[PDB]
Ligand binder design. Structure first.
Ligand SMILES: *[C@@H]1O[C@H](CO)[C@@H](O[C@@H]2O[C@H](CO)[C@@H](O[C@@H]3O[C@H](CO[C@H]4O[C@H](CO)[C@@H](O)[C@H](O[C@H]5O[C@H](CO)[C@@H](O)[C@H](O)[C@@H]5O[C@H]5O[C@H](CO)[C@@H](O)[C@H](O)[C@@H]5O)[C@@H]4O)[C@@H](O)[C@H](O[C@H]4O[C@H](CO)[C@@H](O)[C@H](O)[C@@H]4O)[C@@H]3O)[C@H](O)[C@H]2NC(C)=O)[C@H](O)[C@H]1NC(C)=O
Ligand SMILES: O=C(NC1CCCCC1)OC[C@@H]1C[C@@H]2CCN1C[C@@H]2C#CC#C[C@@H]1CN2CC[C@@H]1C[C@@H]2COC(=O)NC1CCCCC1
Ligand SMILES: [Ca+2]
Ligand code: NA
Ligand code: NA
Ligand SMILES: [Zn+2]
Length: 804
């Protein structure tokens, strides 16, 4: 019923309720604009730039923008008015000058924030397109910038833009792809279409809502595609001239480019130079406009992309029809990732287990890997949502998967795409922050886009809703307004047991050839059990236990552990391996040795009988016997308190890691400190399980089986200092290995471990923060480093990609 009028209402900030017609920046998308929207709100007469002959002109309300004398006071000049008509310079031509304080017009309560988001803007464009982007290159070199920013998985538009707005992983905000089926709604969601407009798809609390609830006004962030970029900028500039009580403090501009073109031409197509020139020109208009309003040293500007773009063509498509015979009983969400479910729920013959088996390592060159979603690398955080299908296909970069060849030619067209694993270099995108609140000429290390919501909240004095960022981890981007995080309080204190049990009290069915057994060396043994070498093996203090539980600290010559009396195994084991340390073998006579620990009761210990009786399950050790400091220290590594349950298929991975890789890293990094332990995440929510969530135990026992094993390997960033004598910043790499009864994930697994184990571990790289969530532990509690710096270390991901 669109018979009302947009007179005095163009780009109104609250949308009026149907069936009265709308004049907001979204009305075109709902086909609901008033009849005179175009005429009044979308003026194009005379274009977007003042020329010499328009200077001082008589206001003509029909023009797109104005060059008349009164346009400044009306706030609707063309962005280049002062340059063409008042002999002013373009913002880009001015030297940069540090903005030490905001320089805002009277009546501004805080520096406004403008988010300039660019679709498909790959990180390497900053260097490779630099010659054609002078405005963006100035923002970058004068402000604060990262070499790149990591998107979330899938590296698609919708999941990423909503992550930027909410600080949440897609699994938690609910936008888990560009397309989705929700079985509870029984409803679908598509990028094109009208179902995306329904609010039930959208979880968490995005920045515009956070702002409004806390009394900070927001511009409407979303723009109908047909509103030209120049008009989007002019609207933002007009809103910024509104009276104090109506003027928003936060705005977004959005560009469909360079993504639109990247799909057609590939990331580096020669056609790609023009779209980059044009985005830059848009940035130029914004900054020229701000400089006219005297706001160019007042506004914080963020220039931020959602994902990169990779070379992908028709001929690089794998087909599920070349693998499966029941192809018609499945529905595939296709392309740069795959999600598979049953075509129909009344068909009880469809079986996920046999689907995965049919797609596993079937061709020597296979360009995708099938996964049950709970087995995907935990760093992707891509499982805990009913909209994510049980079966997922991780697709190689540069490839697609499709169901049938017909789907690809009857449903080439494209040379670029994205969606791949968020560790892939081509998927990385950009971040620049410019303004009074950001640092001056400062480079910062790469970080994840989940972190930005907190910083945007900080920029606006807002308290962020609960999110997946680690607040404080990006304080180094900011001149001021930092948020001063504090360490979580330890919840459980440890017990420190001494010798309390005699060996004969234990009936564990365990045996060791150790009775083949002096106040020189017994005086030594006693010190080692009280913590005399603890300074060596626990470098950053004990991890804090952030939940209620019962555990013991156990000291040894070569290692220290936090032993859970509830889970019957360590929550963590800490040890340092110097560059000079030697690897030894496990002597023949000690092959099956397991020794009772006289500090811990029989009832709180594992037993060997359970393993003997459990045909599927074996056991491994957290501190490795291979790295013992001496033949006598080696007996400690065989304590029942150092033992953990491991599938034999997993033992192969773990033994190679402990025998070969630990020593390799100590060699390369000049010593390493290792913390290892189990993870239980049976409901795949990325958070430590309570005992009543455990779905598997060693047969006949109360010994819970971990879903994963982690290690955190820390050393000195300046590797001329040894790990145990480091004066400055730390360096860390970590992993969360899935504890699986087979090695089907590794197609090369029947070859020697030196050909596949390390590749598996790299796939399963993790942030310390991911391990924290999964264990309820807090690491690096006692260092000489600032807490903000430690938060940054905890969010670091070692990616094993070459250098961008
Ligand atoms: C990443 O960061 C987020 C945010 O901090 C973390 O997610 C939070 O996790 C906590 C702890 O588990 C959740 O607490 C539980 O809350 C529910 C009530 O939840 C409702 O209210 C909140 C608050 O407004 C909403 O955000 C919730 O929204 C969810 O559901 C709607 C659909 O209804 C949807 O629009 C959203 O996308 C969102 O979905 C996601 O979360 C749900 C689970 O909550 C999940 O099923 C889904 O797959 C999505 O991932 C919602 O409207 C409450 O019922 C629970 O109490 C129960 O457990 C207690 C034990 O304490 C029992 O005593 C009791 O009997 C209850 O059964 C929880 O307290 C919180 O909801 C959640 N927030 C969000 C936004 O997801 C992640 O954990 C972080 N991830 C990592 C890896 O760290
Ligand atoms: O133009 C912009 N600017 C961006 C700047 C950077 C931040 C995000 C937006 O984006 C281009 C958009 C993004 C999406 C993909 C491509 N293209 C169309 C798509 C869509 C849509 C779209 C839409 C409409 C706008 N609001 C409201 C109406 C629908 C749905 C949506 C979501 O609204 C709530 O989130 N409210 C809820 C959320 C949870 C709290 C309670 C209220
Ligand atoms: Ca869990
Ligand atoms: Na034995
Ligand atoms: Na066994
Ligand atoms: Zn795209």
């Amino acid at each position: 019923a669109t018979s009302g009028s947009c007179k005095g209402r163009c780009f109104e900030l609250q949308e009026v309720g149907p069936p009265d017609c709308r004049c907001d920046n979204l009305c075109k998308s709902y086909s609901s604009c008033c009849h005179d929207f175009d005429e009044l709100c979308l003026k194009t007469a005379r274009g977007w730039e003042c020329t010499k002959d328009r200077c001082g002109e008589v206001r003509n309300e029909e023009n797109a923008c104005h060059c008349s004398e009164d346009c400044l006071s009306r706030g609707d000049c063309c962005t280049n008015y002062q340059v063409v008509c008042k002999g002013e310079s373009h913002w880009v031509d001015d030297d940069c000058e540090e903005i030490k304080v905001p320089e805002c017009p009277a009546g501004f309560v805080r520096p406004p924030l403008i988010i300039f988001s660019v679709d498909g803007f790959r990180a390497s464009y900053m260097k490779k397109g630099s010659k054609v982007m002078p405005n963006i290159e100035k923002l970058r070199s004068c402000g604060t910038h990262a070499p790149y920013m990591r998107p979330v998985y899938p590296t698609k538009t919708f999941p990423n833009l909503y992550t930027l707005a909410t600080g949440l992983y897609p699994e938690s905000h609910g936008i888990v792809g560009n397309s989705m089926y929700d079985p509870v709604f029984d409803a679908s969601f598509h990028l094109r279409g009208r179902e995306k407009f329904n609010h039930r798809w959208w979880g968490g609390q995005p920045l515009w809502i956070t702002a409004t609830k806390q009394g900070v006004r927001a511009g409407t962030f979303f723009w109908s595609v047909s509103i030209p970029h120049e008009r989007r900028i002019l609207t933002i500039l007009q809103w910024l001239s509104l009276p104090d009580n109506e003027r928003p403090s936060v705005y977004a501009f959005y560009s469909e480019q360079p993504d639109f073109s990247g799909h057609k031409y590939g990331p580096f197509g020669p056609e790609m130079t023009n779209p980059l020139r044009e985005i830059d020109k848009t940035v130029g208009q914004l900054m020229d406009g701000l400089k006219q309003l005297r706001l160019h040293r007042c506004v914080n500007v963020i220039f931020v992309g959602d994902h990169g773009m990779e070379d992908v063509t028709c001929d690089r498509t794998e087909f599920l029809s070349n693998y499966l015979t029941n192809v018609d009983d499945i529905t595939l969400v296709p392309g740069t990732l795959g999600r598979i479910r049953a075509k129909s729920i009344n068909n009880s013959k469809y079986d996920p287990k046999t689907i995965i088996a049919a797609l596993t390592c079937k061709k020597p060159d296979q360009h995708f890997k099938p996964y049950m979603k709970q087995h995907l690398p935990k760093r992707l955080h891509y499982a805990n949502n009913r909209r994510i299908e049980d079966i997922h296909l991780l697709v190689d970069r540069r490839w697609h998967v499709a169901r049938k060849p017909l789907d690809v030619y009857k449903k080439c067209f494209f040379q670029g795409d994205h969606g791949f694993d968020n560790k892939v270099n081509s998927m990385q995108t950009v971040f620049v922050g410019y303004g009074p609140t950001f640092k001056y000429r400062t480079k910062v290390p790469p970080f994840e886009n989940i972190e930005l919501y907190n910083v945007m909240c900080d920029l606006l004095g807002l308290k962020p809703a609960p999110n997946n960022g680690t607040h404080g981890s990006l304080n180094h981007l900011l001149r001021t307004n930092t948020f001063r995080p504090t360490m979580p309080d330890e919840v459980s204190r440890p017990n420190y047991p001494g010798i309390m049990y005699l060996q004969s009290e234990f009936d564990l069915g365990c045996t060791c050839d150790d009775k083949v057994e002096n106040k020189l060396e017994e005086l030594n043994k006693r010190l080692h059990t009280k913590g005399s070498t603890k300074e060596r093996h626990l470098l950053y203090g004990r991890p804090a236990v952030l939940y209620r539980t019962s555990y013991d600290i156990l000291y040894h010559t070569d290692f220290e552990s936090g032993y859970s009396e509830i889970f019957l195994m360590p929550l963590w084991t800490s040890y340092t391996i110097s560059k000079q340390a030697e690897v030894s073998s496990i002597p023949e006579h000690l092959t099956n040795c397991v020794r009772p620990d006289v500090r811990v009761s029989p009832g709180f210990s594992q037993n060997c009988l359970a393993y003997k009786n459990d045909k599927q399950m074996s056991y491994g050790f957290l501190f490795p016997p291979y790295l013992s400091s001496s033949p006598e220290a080696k007996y400690d590594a065989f304590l029942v308190t150092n033992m953990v349950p491991m599938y034999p298929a997993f033992k192969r991975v773990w033994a190679y890691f402990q025998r070969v890789l630990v020593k390799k890293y100590a060699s390369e990094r000049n010593g390493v400190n290792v913390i290892s332990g189990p993870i239980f995440d049976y409901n795949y929510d990325g958070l430590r399980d309570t005992e009543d969530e455990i779905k598997q135990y060693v047969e006949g026992s109360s010994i819970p089986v971990p879903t994963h094993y982690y290690s955190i390997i820390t050393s000195c960033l300046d590797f001329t200092q040894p790990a145990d004598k480091c004066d400055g910043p730390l360096s860390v790499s970590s992993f969360i290995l899935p504890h699986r009864p087979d090695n089907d994930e590794s197609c090369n697994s029947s070859e020697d471990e030196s050909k596949w184990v390390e590749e598996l571990m790299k796939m399963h790289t993790a942030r310390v923060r991911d391990i924290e969530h999964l264990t309820g532990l807090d690491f690096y509690r006692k260092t000489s480093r600032s807490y903000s710096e430690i938060l940054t270390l905890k969010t670091y991901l070692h990616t094993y990609e070459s250098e961008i």
